[PDB]
């Protein structure tokens, strides 16, 4: 089933639109309809939108295939990077004033502001760092965490996922009692850097436990789709059927996360009842999409490989839960290099 | 266990334990303290010695680096030569005079002859062939075991195992009944042959069956302990456990030759009563010194691997 982007770009919301959508046109193409309207749909999202580099790398992507309103403007550009400059001016000056003032939260202020207006202008380093700054001139819990979100945003965007696991650990760690969505958030970011670090059994143990209200409310980062696939998929990749059986087949609350995939549902469904082959035709038939998504392409052929080994093994062998551990331990090696092992023995 | 040299050299006796160092100096190594141990034993044996081939050999390998008595020796290296040369030319008048004469025996011995000084010399093809040409002159069967364990020594050397199995092929076959040793003596060299043409599980046989009286008494080839180690595995890699418990656990000839080698038996009882990590272990402690061995060597992935499949669905019977 082929691709939509109306209604997957929809689902996104800041920097991570964007990038997504010159993902997919990026790579998979070979399929320029899907190529160009993502090119199409990202010069227009980015046209909106304060970064005139980005601005121009799509431009010379599109490369006046798309006409006259997808060409480049030299009169945005400049434009943009003048008010930059005097916004910019505008802040530092107002930044001098409250240092010297000894104001705490215009401080706090000012330095968030600043990190806003390096994201925004695409400069992802210096955004980073004015959130930190903020740190010291943090009076309240609300001031703390709204530091390590930013700061894992911008983490993610530059792809460092260690820093997103440190600042997510920072926030948790907060003695108070905070806001369940704000932990629906945490949950989100520790999974998917659990997922981008390849730790996959601590990625779907993440998901899984998401609030199912989070809906789109962490947006600029993920959407309930991605938490059912990613989590689905980790699960089925990780677990034994024991905890496949706790904590997928009988969690209620993730059901309303599977409910909007009803493919990996099923697929899911068809591998817990020892349909295997449905469940890899299924895989199969999601491969290309599956391969679109930015988090996740990296690791699609590792998780499918990882249940179809499961799969090999529960389908042959004399355990249904398979103690795989057990028998590691007994041949000095890891679960994934026995399951390698086993394999070979298995189709021969 | 970390190897020494000393104890393992002094198990062999004539060209095998030349070759041995050399094998040992030229590969693990990492280990430098091994090395020029190896090389300084070399050196030493080989100067004793009718092979300058082997001597220049030994002496650009080590390049100077035991310091100024493990180099070059001119005077050394002259006189064999030309000991050698003389000796030639008498062997060479001879075996003509004794062609001249018809006498059968004589050109038989001469030829023989001929095959010892090529051998000594370093020239195993020669070698091979003189021993090989005593077969137009025997008359006797011993005659003919004698042209065989020749042939097999020299294609050992040469390492041409498949002519190893002929000879053994034709020694074996003596409508006489063979002496117990050179029956153990064959028995060895078809082991040995069969290891190097990678069919481990006739190998196994082969050496499980040597009689435990043989000792050292076949030295210039092979040790007991080599006996036990290439039996040992070679089952493992190969036998159902129906006749590893036969001709291995129960064998209590063979539990002569395995008592030199604990580590090998131990890892045989902890595979056969499925104890899968001690075994491994094992296998893991003894890799460094198999791959020191001249012989096993190439074989020790592969047996490992298979040994480790068994092992595995050994692990899956309910």
């Excluded at 817990?272 to 299924?282: G, K, N, P, V």
């Excluded at 391969?291 to 004399?318: C, E, W």
Aim: net charge neutral; hydrophobic share 40%.
């Amino acid at each position: 089933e082929p691709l939509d982007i109306e209604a997957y770009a929809a689902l996104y919301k800041g920097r991570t639109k964007i990038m997504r959508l010159l993902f997919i046109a990026n790579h998979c193409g070979g399929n320029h309809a899907l190529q160009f309207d993502a090119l199409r749909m990202a010069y227009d999202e980015i046209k909106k939108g304060e970064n005139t580099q980005l601005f121009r790398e799509v431009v010379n992507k599109i490369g006046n295939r798309l006409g006259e309103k997808y060409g480049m403007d030299l009169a945005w550009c400049e434009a943009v990077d003048r008010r930059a400059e005097q916004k910019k001016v505008k802040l530092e000056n107002e930044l001098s004033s409250y240092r010297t003032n000894l104001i705490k939260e215009s401080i706090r202020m000012g330095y968030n502001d600043f990190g806003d207006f390096y994201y925004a202008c695409g400069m992802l380093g210096d955004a980073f760092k004015n959130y930190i700054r903020t740190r010291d001139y943090c009076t309240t819990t609300k001031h703390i965490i709204h530091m390590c979100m930013n700061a894992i945003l911008v983490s993610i965007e530059m792809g460092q996922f260690t820093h997103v696991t440190s600042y997510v650990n920072k926030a948790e760690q907060n003695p108070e009692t905070l806001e369940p969505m704000v932990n629906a958030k945490l949950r989100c970011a520790s999974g998917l850097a659990h997922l981008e670090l390849k730790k996959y059994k601590l990625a779907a143990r993440k998901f899984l436990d998401v609030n199912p209200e989070l809906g789109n409310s962490y947006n600029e980062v993920i959407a309930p789709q991605d938490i059912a696939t990613y989590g689905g998929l980790c699960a089925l990749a990780s677990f034994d059927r024991s905890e496949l059986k706790q904590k997928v087949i009988d969690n209620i609350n993730f059901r309303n996360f599977l409910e909007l995939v009803p493919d990996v549902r099923e697929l899911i469904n068809d591998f817990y009842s020892s349909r295997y082959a449905s469940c890899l035709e299924y895989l199969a038939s999601l491969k290309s999409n599956l391969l679109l998504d930015i988090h996740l392409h990296d690791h699609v052929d590792t998780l499918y490989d990882q249940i179809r080994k499961k799969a090999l093994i529960q389908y042959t062998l004399p355990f249904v839960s398979v103690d795989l551990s057990r028998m590691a331990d007994a041949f000095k090696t890891s679960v994934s290099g026995l399951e390698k092992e086993l394999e070979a023995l298995i189709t021969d």
